[PDB]
Structure formats: structure tokens, C-alpha cells
RNA sequence: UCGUUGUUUUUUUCUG
């Protein structure tokens, strides 16, 4: 109801795919090219184009509308941008998995150390599981040390023996063991090499180790082009008022950019073969830090601050992560946190709400013919005045403030539209306590608006929730809609838990005074 | 099938006591006057004397109040432990059903044997849990339902329905209705979410708490501890 | 709404206010889709009512999803990631 | 807005260059596949049909309709202005007259007849039933897809269409 | 209304005799914080005295 | 295909307490938004006592379908489930 | 030429309409809703098959907004040109970059440089009109013509006919 | 500029101690100019929305720089009530 | 656990989620596959044909 | 003249 119309159909997601993006489909999605490191035009405004800040990838202030999908803070998701590198570099996640891959495979044919022949392998291919079958095709692969070039009719192969790789950090070391003994002449596994040699790999090679050819096609494994999240992923923080500083992720993208830039000028000049190496290193290594900050054996990257970086997947991981943090638990609206204080002249189901919170929170009424006048004395209470509204909402979603409404008297309600009535009697709002050890530890109740500022209970729900009147809180989340309601209503009220399933026993009971008065 | 918060704890008759005192308890005797059921309790007390098809109908019940002894005995409670949790009350709905009708005095029944011995059969083959002809389908209700069919079966025995009980024939009737209606309330609900509610509740007694018990065991438990302390 | 609690909810099986009370109380979005890479780089101008994907060079094959605001974000680091999520309204098994 | 009866059909890979609709080359698209499959999913083949027995159809559904409009109680615009809409009724009346003026068989026997003589690629044969070309030469000259079949019996069929030509 | 954000007294009601200023005054009914408590009350326009030049004056601002 | 014809529907003939709740909210949500009433009201203003009291007549226009954990599905209208 | 299809459409019914007959309604909102409207995967939707006995099944209900989804499939007939093939024309008006001719529910547009020599544009005949050897061109004239190009904008393709190969121009 | 109100700011930026304040209440009016008329933002210091209470002194100085140094402190009573704590 | 391990093997593999699950519905801010949301509701007609005349929809 | 926005980052001592 509150988005704006769209004519795209609306529908709900059964499916998600997974893989990697290729670097075609990268520059097709990418509006602009991003290559100058500075991002802010002349400190004059209007940053600079071409730039980090480009309007066209979505604009992140209010008066601003996006230069690509025109609209504003309300709808723009932000819109990629790519970034082209001179030099291919390991992607930091997949370097083990490239190893094994580079294992498996022939360094100059390009195919599998071995064919069909094998019955080993020949069973293994069989496998539907990609990545149980991949872990097969390795163990019998990494065995052979020699890329035979006759049929173990020749194979195609290379001859050349398979090297032993080690990885090293961020590097990886090849160790051939050349025809009887000879010098072992290892060498840097350079990525543009092992990407030409990806490239050649055929789709029946490809399917049998895993892979896919649409999706998972492992040269995408080795970045060549590295796309630009837009602002919003990556917001300016305001330290005070006008100053905003830099998000460590433009902090690192305009490095990023600034080195690769680096290595575009070393080849037109003198290019010594040892500034390219560390030039290019370290160019490998911002990328790494800018994808992930927390590589074992090696330095952090820091700011000047000294503080380390936020890399990507140092924000998804841990509590504070997303998974854990915005997308399993998220801080809700129409909610409350009080004191609680014993009642026993409440009904078992019931609840005391402090006045003010009820004036505060709001549940949302559809106006019809069985509740126009009543709503309708509601709306002329005022929102200061309880019971009482806020809001008015119109079939289209136009809402009125009755703050600033001085001509409420003026207003008639319409069928079909919706009115935020206070808190009042007899509505059912969720209860809970943190911590929600066990399902009793969180029902729904029966509101009683009552003065003071104290949530009440009635002494004998405590049980359930393991509460105590020295200065406990419990939270309150109230529905917003007619469903919520019901099921609030007919699953977690306090009457229908009164037998745990735990220990099919009843869980509430008579307790102190009460008990004490009783015997 | 049975959700968590629909059962109690009852004790199954016919597990303890004696052969003598089963025998005593359960059998029923028509040639032996003496062990024969006592004829001012039941309005045709000489109607029954010296038959033989209500012998046979008896010694069938009493065979399968046997051979229900013998199976649960031997193979579903070793121990001998006759308490366990199983839905439906019966001791309260007999007594519902005692003072609803007024089933005091020692008025003698109306009741006739096969109309008992019939409807409790009946029961036994009512007590749905899987809805479905399919051989397996049958097979597995029968498996389901074969402890609450033996407690049934212990409970509602013609002695002790004509003796102890004393129902009429309204009485027996209502009770039979009640029960089913109880069993078909007292099972799991699809959609029922009932692995959160396994954890919760396993884990929520931990929270309060030679060999090594307490949380320490159970750690060891949960992750499969090779070598354990 | 700490995990906690959102476990005890789905224990009660209160589905839809489990739903509305992560995305309509808290932070929920409308987003584009192109129904052919899966992807949401939809260009969408709702006062020009005109869409397409540049990739696909598709403007009919479009869909729109309503999914909390961090989960799109999450997307984003995704593809910012090297890595595309597809998302897609139906089963092809 | 407008659905459709094929599912799936995610990126693919490897592309082909049968996708720009082509009658002479018979690249169809994926909408009108060779053997498609309906909402129920029961095997139902391609239909195409000629000009005279699609005007046939549509004026005897939209009598039909307007019989049903009106409870008990026949030309292009009259059968026209059953649609409702100043675009759909633009649309409808314009479609049938193009029917009507390019109906090369107007009448229910006429329409039988050639029907019956024609009732392989659904799409040749209806084209065929649908193209009238005077001798097999102009038939294909005009229609570049049966120039070669080893089976042509068309000289026959082009007679029997010309019999069957009203006079005008 | 260009009369908010002036003090102004209460001459009928439960708080007769207390001062205040207005803080809202949407219409036809003010609502004007209590200097001895922490608390704001509503109350028409009719049961206000208005701080002026000249001592208190009824609502004839 | 995936639907059962009405002659074997073999799934339990009452009313799981799931459903319970999403007939009465989808039916108080329907009421409350001006749709017909099929039933009699005396003095009931709530929308969801009215859902009940519809419910309790055996009166609700709807049909409540099955998903087995294969993927095929069965009916069920709420005027034929044996409601506790 | 035509195609017979399956056609199906996704209706959205508000609970005020909740009614015995909403079958009917909802056929009649689609029989209004669906003609005119053209796409470049199916085009021009000009008539409607079994406009009385169209199969709704049952719908359903959307939550969280209450409203009917119904999925109404049926069966239509609609048109749309592919290049490569011929059929004839009748032209409607002349204009100097090339004659339109409309053909049915579309219009044809014929380029300067795929036109007949021979034939030259007379706006002193009356009738204006094209005049040849043998051959005369005027609205309602049978005119054959190959279309080639079809650029379909969404809306309403754009079609071009040209008259400049072997057994084109008028019979 | 706050949604709450300036009025009790006296001429000079400050409030004067003796007088009334209240949630969503300006005490102090600072304005930053503009980085380039109309060039001047609110740099306020409006008082809690949640507390009360009574100006009671206002210190002003300078700080080590030199630039005026001021303080505001607010006082008010707080009356034992329902929910309150004590112990022992 | 190890989110991001777990999401690296997935895009290598291309995994593939049905979205069956509860903790997917959730993210997605989808009625989950539990409780109220095991099932679906229809709207019928063969019942709703019984209205008397004048409830017919406009 | 509706409209009308207010930081992050850590560390700390606390509450149940
Ligand atoms: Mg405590
Ligand atoms: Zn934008
Ligand atoms: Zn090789
Ligand atoms: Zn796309």
C-alpha cells in the first residue's frame, strides 16, 4: 500500500541461484565506467563524473533524483558500476579451491589428468552431488604426477610433468620436477596464466569437476573486472553536521583505483621487472583487503587511524553481521519497555499499559459502517486526548497528521479508510521477556489502560516467565493489521498455554500470598 | 500422533497383580456360580446361568485380556513399571458419567454382556489416528493405537463395568461417545512446529542445572564426544 | 526482535505476524526484477512506466518483490561480491 | 500482463540464431514451438489458420456473444460494435473488414470444402490454404518454402482452389 | 493565530489560579503547559487569562 | 494431477487449530473491509466476532487447500470440516 | 496468417465484488480488458474464443491484502506479421516518403528507394494516385507487397512493405 | 531550524536561569555560517524530550582557545512513586 | 555458522535453494512453509453461488 | 504554505 504503483506484476521469490558473475554480464549491468581515484570534482560541488560518486549510480540526498532511474531516497536501490583492471587478480575467497582446480587439471593441455578410462573416475563422474563428486575427482587426481601425453591414440595431454603446488598466502608456487633428476624450476603461478589456461577447458571437463557452464564457469574465479557497489551501500558517515568522512569501503575502492591506475603507467615507461612484481602485489593485495580484511599469516590493513579496515565479509560475519543483525533480528516499530509490578486485581489474560504508552502507540482501524460514528468520535477526541487517533489514512495512502490538522472538525471519514486509534480496552498485544527461553515465555494479553507507568500482571504469570517485581522489564509488541489479531488471539493467549507441552503439566499456578493464604 | 499436552499419567490394570489375582479380577465364571457374576446387580442374573454362547464371548474377551497381558508384560514394560502417560482419562470420564446419571444405590443393570463386549470391540477398531484403506495404512494404525486399545480393553472389562461401575446402558453409551470424542481431540495438528518445540523444551531444564552429570555430560552428548572423560 | 524470539514465535506458529513484524513493522522495500537473469538491475522509471534490463535488453520479462530493505543490501554486497544471486517466481525443479 | 503456457526458459549459455520470427526459414520462436503444451497440459499441436476460416470463426463467436448479450435476439460493423472500447471497437472493426476483403472463402460450404480438400509442417499447409496462387509456378515463386519437397501436388490442389473461386 | 508562546492564567476549572504559556493552539482549544508540575493540560479558549500590558486580561486579545 | 479427487481425500476431517486462526483472520480481514455478511448480525460490531459467529454457523465461503509434502494437493471447504 | 491459442490472464478481485455471479464479472472485465492491447511476443488482440465458457477454476486469496487472485485462462485468436512472409495489401493514404497502406489493424509504411521506376507520384489525377503500365494503385486496391522488418514497439509494431521485387506491386 | 521553540533564548544565544523549560526545548541557540544571504545552520542544543525541570544556572566563559564557553543546568524533584526502586 | 564459507561453496557450486525452508521464507519476508502459512486459501464459487439474487457482484 | 531532517566509531561502568 505505501509503495508507489508499478505495472511490473507482483509476485513472491521461490528460488535463488547462486554463482558467479561474468565479466561480460558485469559491464552489461555497470551504467559508467569509474577510473578517476578523486572523488569530489573541485570541492565546489557536484562531484566529479567518472568518478566515485557519479549521480548516475543513485542519488543519496533527499533533493537529488537519481540520473539513471529518477527517483528519489524512497526507491532508487543504487546502481552498479564496474571498474576495469589492467591486471588479473586472484579473487582471495577461492584460492584453495583454485589450487585444487589447477591440481586436477593439465598445466599446458588444459584437460583432466586422466579420461574415462579409469573406472575410479569413470563411477565418480556418476556422482549428482557437484561437490562430492569434485572431492572424488581430486583424490584420484592429485595422485597422478604426470600429465601423460599418450592414452594411459594419443590424449591431447602435454607431456610435462604436473607440478606440485603449495599455496603461500597470497601466492602460489608451482614445482616441477623436470626430466632423471633435474633443477626444480617452480615459479609464480601468475592469474593471467592460469586464466588462459581456464579458458581452454572444455564443458565436459567442467561438469565433471562441479563446475557449470552458465553460471560456475572457473576462469570467473580470477577477477578482471571488479564492480562498484553504488553510495547507498556504501553511505557517507557524518562525523559532525556538514563534515562527513569517507566509508572505509570508499577509502578502499578509490586505492584500489589509484593502483590499478599505477600499473597502467608502469608499462609506458621504465618497468623493471621488480616494480611491476611488488606494484602488482600490492595492487593484489588492496583488492584482497577491499574483499576480505582477515587473512591469516598476514598484516591487517589499517587506516591512518590505525583502526583495521571493514572488509565485506568482515560486515556479513558475527552477531553484529547481517545474517545476525538486520536480517534473523531487526529493532521493530510499536513496541515499549517498562517496569512491571504485580496486580492480583487483573484477570489472568489481562495487562496493565501505562496511559501514555497507549496514547503513544497506534493500531491502525478500517472504517466501516459498524464503527464510522465511534471512529469518527475518536478522530474529534483528538490525538491528545484518549481514547483518540493520530492519523488518517486515505484509500490512496495520503496520511493527515491530526497534530497539525487545526480542522479536524472538518474531516469526514470515508468508507475503505484507515484510522490509527489509540490503545484501547480489550485489544490483544503480544507480551514478552528477554530472555525467550521457551514458547511460554512470551503470550498474547488482554489491554486494561490503566494510570502510573508500570506494566502490571497478575501474580500468577510470573511462573511462565521467570519474573520478579525487583525491577524487571518485559517488552510489548503490539499487531498492526486484522490477521495479527486473530492469531494473536486464538494461539498465544494466555489461556490456551496453560498445560506446557514440555511435560504436559500446567505451568502457571497459585503462588506466594495467595498460596500461603489458601493453605 | 498424540500432541505433548494431551496426555496423563495412568496405570494400565492388567500389567501387576498375580495370575490369581487377575484371574480373579478379570475372569468371569458362569458354570461356577461362586465365581460367577453377582446376580442382584444385573436385572437377568438367571437369564445368563449355565449359557454357553455368552461363555464364549467371555472366554474370547478373556483371552484377549491374556494375550494383552502377555504382550505388554513381555515385550513393550520389562520392569513391570504400569504408570505411563496416554491420553484420554478414563477414570475421570467414568466418574462423569457416574454422577451425571446418578449411578448410585446398587440398582441393577440393564446392560446385557455382548452389548458390552460388542461396543467395545467397536471402539478398538474407531480410535482413527491415519485415515486411509491402504494395507500399510491399516497395518500402521493398528501398530499406533495397540497400547491405548490394551488400557481400554483393561479398563472397560464386563466385571468390572457390571460391578464396580454399575452403568446402565445410557451411561455406557455416553462414555463410549466421550471417548472417541476425546481420543480424535487429543492428536498432534499438522503444521505443528514441533522440532523448536523438542529443543525448547530439552534445552530449558538444562538452564536450570563417580561418573559426570549436568551440563558437562550433555555437552559431551551433543557434539559427539569421541573420547569421553 | 532478538532471535530468540523469533524462534519462539514460529513455536506457536504464528506465521503471518511473524511475516508483517519483520518487514511492515520494521524495514520493509519494494525492488525490480528481470524474469530472465534473475537479477535486479531492472532500470525502472515509474513516472515513465518503463523498464528494462540492459543485460537481457528485456522490458516485459520484469517482476517486483517486497523484501526487507537489508536483505537487498545484503544482495548488493553480493554482486559487489563477484558473486550473483538469481532470484526467480517460479520452480524449475 | 498477458500470460503464457511455456515456463522456465532461464539464460542459457550457448544462444541460437532461431529466435526473429521467419516464415521462409521456419524459426518460429519459443511461443510456437513444434509440439507445444496447453494449460492442462494435454498434447495439443500447433493451429494456424487461413484468412477465410479465421473471419469464419470470429464472426460465428461474436454472434455468438452478442446472442448472449442480448438474451434470444451479423455485419462487420455491427458485429464490430459488440466490442466495448473506442480502441477495441477501432481495432475489431478494422480486422474484420480486412477479413471480409481478403476472405478468399466467404460462405460455410465454400470454407468445408477447401477445409475438407486440405483436411508435414502445420505452418506450409496452412499457408498454402491460405496463399492462392493461379498455376504451381506463382505458388512457388510467391512461397519460397515448398520449392523443393520432392512431393509437390500442388497443380491439383491450385485447380480445385480455383474451382472453388466465387465469381466477382 | 499570532498569539502563541504567551503566558497565560486559568480563571475556571480544577487549576483556577495557576500560570502558563501556550504551547498548541490548533483551535479552540489550548493546550498550556503548568509551571508547578511537569505536566501539560488541555483547555478551551474560554478559560484563559492573558498576560498583557495592563495587569490580566480575558481573552479579548 | 496434483489434485485429489473428493471421493479419496484421505487427510484428518476436522479442523487443525492452524486453520482455525487464518479462516478467522482472512474472514474478519474480508468483513472488515466492506464485504457481503452472510450471516445475521444482532449487536456484534467486532469484525472478528462476527468471524467467529459466522464460523460457528458453518457459514464461510472458503476453501482450504493441502499441501502434502510431495507437492500434490487436496480441498477441503470449510462448510464440510468438523469444527471442534 | 492467424494463430489459435491458450491464452491465460492474472485477475485481482477486490472483496466488495464477492458476489455469486463474479464469474461473470470477471469475464466481462476481461472481455473489455483484453482486446486492443498488443505485445511483441503474441501482437495485435483482436477477438476473444468462448466468450461464455471460460474455465476461472478457483482463486485465490492474497494475504495480507485480502483481494481474490484469480489465474483466467481461455482461449484466443490474434495476429501478427513475421518477415518473410507475403500476403497482400490495400494502401490508405499517399505521402511522399512512401504510400501508408493499411493492412488491417496495422498500417504500412514503404520506403523512397523500394519503389517501382516506373511509377511516379501524380497529385493531378483525381483521385491522387499512382499510376504504371497496367498498373493502378488507390485505396481498396488488392496491392502485394513483402514485409521484412518487423520492429515491434510494445504498443503497436511498426511494419514496412516494399514493392520492389519480382511479383510485387498490385494483381 | 528544530521543530521545537526558541522563544525562551534570550537576545544574546542563552536562557536565563528562573525560567520554565521542557522536553523538545531549545536551550541554546548556536548557528554555524554557511560555506558559500541565508547562510547560517542550527547548531542548538535542545534539551532532552524526556526531561523537566528549571534553569538554575547558567555559566559562561572562556574555553582554553579563547571561543565562549557556556553550561546550563537544569534541576527538578523527583517524587518517589509506583515503580520505583529500594532496597535495604 | 561460517556464513561466508558457506555462501563461497555455494556460488562455486551454483548451488541451487528451493526456498522450502523457514529460515529462507524469513529472510525473504515470505509466509513461511509452518503453522498459519501450511496451506492456502481459496475462494469458492459453487458456495457463494447461493447468495440470494441481490448479492450478485456489479 | 503543507513540508520538515540529526553521526559514527570504539571503550567503559551498570540493569534483569
Ligand atoms: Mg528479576
Ligand atoms: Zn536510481
Ligand atoms: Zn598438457
Ligand atoms: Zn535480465
Known amino acids: 500500500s505505501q509503495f508507489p504503483y508499478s505495472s511490473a506484476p507482483l509476485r513472491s521469490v521461490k528460488e535463488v541461484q547462486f554463482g558467479l558473475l561474468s565479466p561480460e554480464e558485469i559491464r552489461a549491468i555497470s551504467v559508467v565506467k569509474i577510473e578517476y581515484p578523486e572523488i569530489m570534482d573541485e570541492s565546489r560541488q557536484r562531484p566529479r563524473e567518472g568518478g566515485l560518486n557519479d549521480p548516475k549510480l543513485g542519488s543519496i540526498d533527499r533533493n537529488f533524483k537519481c540520473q539513471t532511474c529518477g527517483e528519489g531516497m524512497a526507491e532508487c536501490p543504487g546502481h552498479f558500476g564496474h571498474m576495469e583492471l589492467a591486471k588479473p587478480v586472484f579473487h582471495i575467497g577461492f584460492i584453495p579451491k583454485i589450487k585444487k582446480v589447477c591440481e586436477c587439471i593439465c598445466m599446458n593441455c588444459g584437460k583432466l589428468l586422466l579420461d574415462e578410462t579409469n573406472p575410479t573416475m569413470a563411477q565418480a563422474i556418476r556422482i549428482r552431488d557437484p561437490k562430492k563428486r569434485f572431492n572424488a575427482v581430486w583424490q584420484l587426481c592429485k595422485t597422478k604426477m604426470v600429465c601423460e601425453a599418450d592414452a594411459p591414440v594419443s590424449r591431447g595431454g602435454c607431456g610435462n610433468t604436473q607440478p606440485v603446488v603449495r599455496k603461500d598466502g597470497m601466492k602460489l608456487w608451482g614445482t616441477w620436477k623436470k626430466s632423471r633428476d633435474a633443477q626444480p624450476e617452480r615459479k609464480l603461478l601468475t592469474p593471467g596464466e592460469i586464466l588462459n589456461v581456464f579458458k581452454h577447458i572444455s564443458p565436459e571437463d567442467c561438469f565433471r569437476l562441479g563446475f557449470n557452464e552458465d553460471y560456475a564457469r572457473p576462469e570467473w574465479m580470477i577477477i578482471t573486472v571488479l564492480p562498484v557497489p553504488p553510495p547507498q551501500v556504501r553511505p557517507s558517515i557524518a562525523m559532525d553536521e556538514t563534515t562527513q568522512g569517507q566509508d572505509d569501503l570508499t577509502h578502499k575502492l578509490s586505492d584500489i583505483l589509484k593502483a590499478n591506475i599505477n600499473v597502467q603507467k608502469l608499462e609506458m615507461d621504465g618497468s623493471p621487472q621488480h616494480i611491476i612484481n611488488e606494484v602488482e602485489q600490492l595492487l593484489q593485495f588492496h583488492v584482497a583487503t577491499y574483499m576480505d580484511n582477515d587473512i591469516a599469516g598476514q598484516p591487517q590493513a589499517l587506516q591512518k587511524s590505525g583502526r583495521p579496515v571493514k572488509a565485506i565479509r568482515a560486515r556479513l560475519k558475527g552477531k553484529e553481521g547481517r545474517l545476525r543483525g538486520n536480517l534473523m533480528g531487526k529493532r521493530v516499530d510499536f513496541s515499549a519497555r517498562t517496569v512491571i509490578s504485580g496486580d492480583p486485581n487483573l484477570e489472568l489474560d489481562q495487562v496493565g499499559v501505562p496511559i501514555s504508552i497507549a496514547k503513544t502507540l497506534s493500531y491502525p482501524e478500517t472504517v466501516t459502517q459498524y464503527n464510522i460514528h465511534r471512529l469518527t468520535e475518536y478522530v474529534r477526541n483528538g490525538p491528545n486526548e484518549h481514547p483518540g487517533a493520530k492519523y488518517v489514512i486515505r484509500d490512496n495512502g495520503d496520511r493527515i497528521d491530526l497534530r497539525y490538522h487545526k480542522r479536524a472538525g472538518d474531516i469526514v471519514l470515508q468508507y475503505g479508510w484507515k484510522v490509527e486509534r489509540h490503545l484501547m480496552d480489550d485489544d490483544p498485544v503480544l507480551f514478552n521477556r528477554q530472555p525467550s527461553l521457551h514458547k511460554m515465555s512470551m503470550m498474547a494479553h488482554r489491554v486494561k489502560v490503566m494510570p502510573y507507568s508500570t506494566f502490571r500482571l497478575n501474580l500468577s504469570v510470573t511462573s511462565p516467565y521467570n519474573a520478579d517485581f525487583d525491577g524487571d522489564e518485559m517488552n510489548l509488541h503490539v499487531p498492526q493489521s486484522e490477521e495479527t489479531r486473530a492469531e494473536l488471539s486464538q494461539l498465544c493467549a494466555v489461556p490456551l498455554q496453560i498445560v506446557s507441552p514440555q511435560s504436559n503439566k500446567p505451568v502457571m499456578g497459585i503462588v506466594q500470598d495467595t498460596l500461603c493464604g489458601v493453605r | ?229 | 526482535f532478538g532471535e530468540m524470539e523469533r524462534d519462539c514465535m514460529i513455536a506457536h506458529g504464528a506465521a503471518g505476524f511473524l511475516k508483517e513484524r519483520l518487514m511492515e513493522a520494521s524495514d520493509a522495500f519494494r525492488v525490480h526484477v528481470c524474469g530472465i537473469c534473475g537479477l535486479m538491475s531492472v532500470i525502472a522509471n515509474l513516472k515513465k512506466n518503463q523498464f528494462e534490463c540492459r543485460s537481457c535488453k528485456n522490458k516485459t520479462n520484469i517482476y517486483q518483490l517486497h523484501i526487507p530493505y537489508a536483505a537487498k543490501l545484503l544482495f548488493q554486497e553480493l554482486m559487489a561480491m563477484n558473486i550473483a544471486p538469481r532470484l526467480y517466481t517460479e520452480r524449475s525443479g | 500482463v498477458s500470460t503464457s503456457t511455456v515456463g522456465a526458459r532461464r539464460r542459457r549459455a550457448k544462444q541460437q540464431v532461431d529466435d526473429e520470427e521467419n516464415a521462409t526459414l521456419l524459426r518460429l520462436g519459443p511461443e510456437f514451438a513444434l509440439k507445444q503444451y496447453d494449460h492442462d497440459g494435454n498434447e495439443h499441436d500447433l493451429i494456424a489458420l487461413s484468412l477465410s476460416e479465421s473471419r469464419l470463426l470470429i464472426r460465428e463467436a461474436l454472434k455468438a456473444r452478442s446472442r448472449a448479450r442480448n438474451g434470444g435476439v451479423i455485419d462487420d460493423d455491427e458485429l464490430a460494435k459488440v466490442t466495448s472500447g473506442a480502441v477495441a471497437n477501432g481495432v475489431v472493426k478494422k480486422t474484420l473488414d480486412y477479413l471480409n476483403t481478403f476472405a478468399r472463402f466467404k460462405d460455410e460450404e465454400t470454407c468445408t470444402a477447401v477445409d475438407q480438400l486440405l483436411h508435414l509442417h502445420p505452418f506450409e499447409i496452412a499457408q498454402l490454404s491460405s496463399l492462392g496462387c493461379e498455376d504451381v509456378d506463382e505458388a512457388i515463386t510467391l512461397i519460397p518454402s515448398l520449392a523443393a519437397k520432392k512431393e509437390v501436388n500442388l497443380q491439383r490442389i491450385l485447380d480445385e482452389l480455383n474451382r472453388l473461386e466465387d465469381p466477382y | 493565530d499570532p498569539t502563541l508562546n504567551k503566558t497565560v492564567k486559568i480563571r475556571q476549572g480544577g487549576y483556577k489560579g495557576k500560570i502558563g504559556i501556550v504551547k498548541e493552539a490548533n483551535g479552540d482549544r489550548f493546550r498550556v503547559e503548568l509551571h508547578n508540575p511537569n505536566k501539560t493540560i488541555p483547555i478551551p479558549c474560554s478559560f484563559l487569562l492573558i498576560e498583557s500590558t495592563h495587569g490580566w486580561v480575558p481573552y479579548e486579545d | 494431477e496434483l489434485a485429489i479427487l473428493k471421493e479419496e481425500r484421505t487427510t484428518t476431517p476436522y479442523l487443525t487449530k492452524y486453520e482455525r486462526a487464518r479462516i478467522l483472520g482472512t474472514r474478519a480481514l474480508q468483513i472488515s473491509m466492506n464485504a457481503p455478511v452472510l450471516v445475521d448480525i444482532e449487536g456484534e460490531t467486532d469484525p472478528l466476532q462476527i468471524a467467529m459467529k459466522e464460523l460457528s454457523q458453518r457459514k464461510i465461503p472458503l476453501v482450504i487447500r493441502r499441501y502434502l509434502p510431495d507437492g500434490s494437493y487436496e480441498d477441503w471447504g470449510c462448510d464440510e470440516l468438523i469444527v471442534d | 496468417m492467424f494463430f489459435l491459442k491458450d491464452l491465460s490472464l492474472i485477475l485481482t478481485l477486490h472483496p466488495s465484488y464477492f458476489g455469486p455471479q463474479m464469474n461473470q464479472y470477471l469475464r466481462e472485465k476481461l472481455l473489455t480488458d483484453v482486446e486492443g492491447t498488443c505485445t511483441g511476443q503474441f501482437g495485435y488482440i483482436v477477438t476473444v474464443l468462448d466468450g461464455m465458457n471460460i474455465d476461472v477454476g478457483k482463486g485465490r486469496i492474497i494475504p495480507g491484502s485480502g483481494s481474490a487472485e484469480f489465474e483466467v485462462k481461455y482461449r484466443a485468436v490474434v495476429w501478427k506479421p513475421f518477415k518473410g512472409e507475403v500476403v497482400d495489401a490495400i494502401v490508405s493514404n499517399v505521402s511522399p516518403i512512401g504510400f501508408f497502406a493499411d493492412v488491417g489493424p496495422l498500417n504500412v509504411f514503404v520506403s523512397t528507394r523500394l519503389i517501382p521506376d516506373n511509377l511516379v507520384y501524380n497529385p493531378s489525377n483525381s483521385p491522387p494516385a499512382y499510376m504504371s503500365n497496367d498498373e493502378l494503385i488507390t485505396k481498396g486496391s488488392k496491392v502485394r507487397l513483402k514485409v521484412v522488418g518487423t520492429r515491434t514497439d510494445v504498443n503497436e509494431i511498426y511494419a514496412i512493405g516494399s514493392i520492389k521485387e519480382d511479383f510485387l506491386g498490385a494483381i | 531550524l528544530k521543530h521545537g521553540t526558541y522563544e525562551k533564548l534570550d537576545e544574546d544565544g542563552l536562557i536565563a536561569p528562573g525560567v520554565r523549560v521542557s522536553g523538545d526545548d531549545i536551550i541554546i541557540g548556536k548557528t554555524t555560517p554557511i560555506p558559500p544571504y541565508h547562510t547560517k545552520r542550527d547548531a542548538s542544543t535542545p534539551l532532552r524530550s524526556t526531561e523537566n525541570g528549571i534553569v538554575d544556572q547558567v555559566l559562561l566563559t572562556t574555553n582554553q582557545e579563547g571561543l565562549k564557553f557556556v553550561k546550563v543546568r537544569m534541576r527538578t524533584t523527583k517524587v518517589p512513586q509506583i515503580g520505583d526502586k529500594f532496597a535495604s | 555458522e561460517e556464513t561466508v564459507e558457506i555462501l563461497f561453496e555455494a556460488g562455486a557450486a551454483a548451488e541451487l535453494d528451493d526456498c522450502r525452508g523457514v529460515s529462507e521464507n524469513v529472510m525473504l519476508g515470505q509466509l513461511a512453509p509452518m503453522g498459519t502459512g501450511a496451506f492456502d486459501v481459496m475462494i469458492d464459487e459453487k458456495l457463494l453461488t447461493s447468495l440470494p439474487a441481490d448479492y450478485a457482484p456489479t
Not at chain 2, 10 to 24: L, N, R, V
Not at chain 2, 195 to 223: D, F, W
Open chain 2, 1 to 229: 500422533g498424540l500432541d505433548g499436552t494431551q496426555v496423563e499419567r495412568q496405570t494400565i490394570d492388567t500389567i501387576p497383580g498375580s495370575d490369581k489375582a487377575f484371574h480373579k479380577r478379570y475372569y468371569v465364571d458362569l458354570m461356577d456360580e461362586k465365581n460367577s457374576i453377582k446376580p442382584d446387580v444385573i436385572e437377568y442374573a438367571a437369564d445368563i446361568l449355565g449359557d454357553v454362547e455368552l461363555q464364549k464371548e467371555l472366554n474370547s474377551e478373556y483371552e484377549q485380556l491374556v494375550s494383552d497381558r502377555k504382550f505388554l508384560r513381555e515385550i513393550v514394560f520389562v520392569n513391570g513399571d504400569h504408570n505411563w502417560p496416554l491420553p484420554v482419562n478414563l477414570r475421570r470420564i467414568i466418574q462423569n458419567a457416574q454422577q451425571i446419571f446418578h449411578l448410585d444405590r446398587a440398582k441393577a443393570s440393564d446392560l446385557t454382556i455382548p452389548e458390552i463386549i460388542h461396543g467395545v470391540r467397536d471402539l478398538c477398531k474407531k480410535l482413527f489416528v491415519l485415515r486411509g484403506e491402504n494395507e500399510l495404512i491399516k497395518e500402521a494404525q493398528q501398530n499406533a493405537t495397540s497400547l491405548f486399545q490394551c488400557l481400554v480393553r483393561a479398563r472397560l472389562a464386563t466385571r468390572r463395568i457390571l460391578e464396580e461401575f454399575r452403568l446402565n446402558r445410557d451411561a455406557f453409551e455416553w462414555v463410549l461417545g466421550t471417548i472417541e470424542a476425546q481420543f480424535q481431540r487429543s492428536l498432534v495438528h499438522p503444521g505443528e512446529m514441533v522440532g523448536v518445540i523438542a529443543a525448547q523444551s530439552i534445552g530449558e531444564p538444562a538452564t536450570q542445572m563417580n561418573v559426570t552429570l549436568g551440563v558437562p555430560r550433555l555437552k559431551e552428548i551433543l557434539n559427539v564426544a569421541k573420547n569421553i572423560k
